[PDB]
């Protein structure tokens, strides 16, 4: 029992990545990396993320490298 002996921590994400961050890039315009950032603060909703994603595509700052360069 110690600060390094307890408990078995583990990944925070799965293949849920992929699943989505693929037809997320497509979602608005986003690329293959961005996008999971915004699967990612939303949880992967897949949704609400996209969705507040595209409306800082013309407010927050998304670097053009995303949608294409």
């Given amino acids: 029992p110690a600060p390094t002996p307890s408990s078995s921590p583990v990944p925070t994400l799965?293949?849920?990545?992929?699943?989505?961050?693929?037809?997320?890039?497509?979602?608005?315009?986003?690329?293959?990396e961005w996008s999971q950032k915004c699967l990612q603060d939303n949880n992967w909703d897949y949704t609400r993320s996209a969705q507040a994603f595209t409306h800082l595509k013309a407010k927050g700052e998304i670097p053009e490298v995303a949608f294409m360069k």
């Fill in 14 to 32: 799965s293949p849920e990545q992929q699943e989505m961050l693929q037809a997320f890039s497509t979602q608005s315009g986003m690329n293959l």
